[model samples]
Target: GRTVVVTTIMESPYVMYKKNHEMFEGNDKYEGYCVDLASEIAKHIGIKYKIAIVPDGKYGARDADTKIWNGMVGELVYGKAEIAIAPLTITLVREEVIDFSKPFMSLGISIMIKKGTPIESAEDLAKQTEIAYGTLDSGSTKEFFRRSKIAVYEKMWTYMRSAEPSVFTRTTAEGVARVRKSKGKFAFLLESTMNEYIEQRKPCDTMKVGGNLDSKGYGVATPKGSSLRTPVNLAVLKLSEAGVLDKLKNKWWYDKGECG
Candidate 1:
């Protein structure tokens, strides 16, 4: 069988460079939850693979103007990769273009703030202009705000659309960096999995400070009509039933957690 090319990102707890990545070549250079999951999936399916990051560094969104998907999603749709194994959420638009395995992990959209910030929820961010907040550019979280009917989220979308010096961020790390550097005036809307991981990372100055905005799961995505889809879905079902998924979560997100 040909070696599969797995699309992913440098997102922490999912895909990250090994501290000694320079000493390693190919798959050995990266390690994290997705890498472990990929390892098991390949073992079960009996195929070898190489991991690579998306060139444009996006999770995939169709630009209204350009009508192009720019991230891991694009790679899968354009036949650049066989599968994408990442924190890429299973959304309706994405599912229309690519196939997703049964969700291997569950998560929700949530907020991240400096530890001492007075905000408590999405409503708080919507009602204030003092603390500027935003989500990662071109992801589902942004789409949620844009399409929201709820007054609070709808209001937030309005402000974010028109805010000067734009509040959006290009990546999770950059959004988190803004929160850290803004002197309590910035908040980041990101996936709960990411928010929780950031809360545990040192400086310990940030907190995941509210209920999730939505519930969803991360799936192993395959190009539509992929031969590996059946095996991949079954692999996830087996892992979940055997509790391998929960164990992996703890391994990457907690057991080896930073900030004690």
Candidate 2:
């Protein structure tokens, strides 16, 4: 029997190293919402899987010139990984290269600013020049801005594209780090789920601002035409309908809240 290869990334409460992860081997080294979701889905589909972190640690995006995808989506596109179960946002472009299951979690692009910052909305950020702001490069948030036609988002895209110090980060953690260290002079644009999770973590210096920019969902991805697609969708639907998805979310996001 062939073991399914799952590609994930290091994201708090989604896929993260267990406290003593260094001492464990393979899947035992990880825990979080996606890890649990993978287990449940595998059980329902009756398959065994091994989880591997995507080598580049990016969610996925296509290069403008070459049109090559990188990160977990790249893995699936190129057959490096058979399935991807990270917080990979479902976008129209990615859907062309791979298949996504029903959304496991819904989120939207949001602003993360250090507590006491002057920002209250996207328009606020767009109108200012004092504070620098950006999103995770090559991920959905950046792509959203790149493709946006809305007046506010279009302004932000142009600004970020021309930012002097490069208003983009390689990872979610990098953006958060910049926000935390910039003394209210930087804001990180990322998914609301991560912003909320980080807000409940120790130090509590960051807080999500304004309503989300747009709505979307994170889904389990598979290579195009893979037989795993249909069953995976069914499993996700079953889990969601039975309230298992919410339970798993609460287990990882709130039950493990560190700030309290």
Candidate 3:
């Protein structure tokens, strides 16, 4: 008898455009791993729910000057939403303010580049000035670089932050598009999951290169001290144990591999 307020973002293969979404309404308008995962969680939890997009288009971050939270993390912190079932990564800063279910999927930050970029590693880009690189402006990937103590990451972040016109992008799509149009001049730092998805998509000139910079997992987030946390966690555990998560990954990921 409870209604859940779910917040998500439009990240491909996670929350994506449905083929016939134009004729659908409400939650029916979207479909992807998160969409199906949300439905599965709701069914298991026995709750009614509505899915909405994050207003600010951010995964979540604290603005240093304002000390204000924005994006899905902000929405949950302000009680604007109860659950975040998007590609929200599990991080210590976010964990301090919210709760995350056991990682439903594991991934890591990776580099994406158009074919034949000549850039092979983060260090490669750091030593040269010809190629530009950056990450989504407000997600864990960006935050990772900002908080990194490693020298290479530290240098990479410095370059991205002080680049003449700024290299930060508001969305993963924009970041990927920049790489596509840069004529081998731009590289995007993002989660490997997304990088792989785009690699297999049409216009498949892009490819994931080298190894992931770091390892992490994606989780369902709930406001700290919220009652839904337990049930959501249990549901995710059940799904993971039952292999539903793996099946979903195969369905949305490798099964539809198109670019070959």
Candidate 4:
């Protein structure tokens, strides 16, 4: 019955650089996968809702960490928001605090390296004398390296923790930018989707790397006992069953440019 705050991070292409500045002043820009999904949920059920920026500080956006859901889910768990719509991945650690809808889309963790970098696999990351890699501070990307079974060093958190410059960032854009300028000495770990998008941009020497160390999907998130889960879940099922979800992806990714 009350208005719900939908939270999200600015993960470029997926949810960055709003196409039309005027859309934010109206209801137009909020029409992509996340926006449309939220609309379906609100329409199918009955509730008032609004989309709000999660900002760089709190949990989701950027801060110098891993740029994942630092405080995105925390917003829902702590009651600052009723729902989170960013590309927040579902994990065991996050599940303890909030509930996820369903696997909205499936993808894997990968790396983006400058075209001529010699690094080939995740294993090479640990000992490559010239190559340095890192991830979003509080996001899944960083956690992948920190908790990976493929990487020989199981204590990456310790490595990132002790690094002189630190191994985490607040957003993916900053991480990617750093990689582009690192002279093939740095690699950025992030979602495959983001990697693909960045590759298309100008001065595109970097390319996504490594066989995805792991696979997972993102979902609409909500507080554990919120009343909106039913409608939101139903909306998700409807989108998947109707093929609208795929349509949206094609429209934004294939049809539209990098910002789709």
Q: What range of 10 consecutive residues in model 1 has the weakest lDDT sum? A: 251-260
Count clashes in each candidate, considering only residues at least 3 apart in sequence or on different chains: 0, 0, 0, 13
Q: Which model, 3 or 4, shows the larger lDDT? A: 3
Q: Could you report the Cα RMSD, in angstroms, for every candidate shown?
A: 1.0, 1.0, 1.0, 3.9
Report, for every candidate in turn, its global Cα lDDT versus the true structure: 0.91, 0.92, 0.92, 0.72
Task: Residues 1-260, candidate 3: write the lDDT tens digits.
Answer: 46778999999988987898899998999999999999999999888999999988889999999988999999999999999999899999999999999999999999999999998888898899989898888889988898899999999988988987778999999999999999999999999999988998989899999899999999999998998999999999999999999999988988989898
Off by over 4 Å in 2: none
Q: Clashes in model 3: which pairs?
A: none
Q: Give candidate 1 regions above 4 Å deviation.
A: none
lDDT score at residue 9, model 1, on the 0-100 scale: 87
Q: Which ten residues in a row have the lowest lDDT in candidate 2?
A: 251-260
Positional deviation of 20 in candidate 1, in angstroms?
Answer: 2.0
- Give the CA lDDT, 0 to 100, for residue 39 in model 4: 72
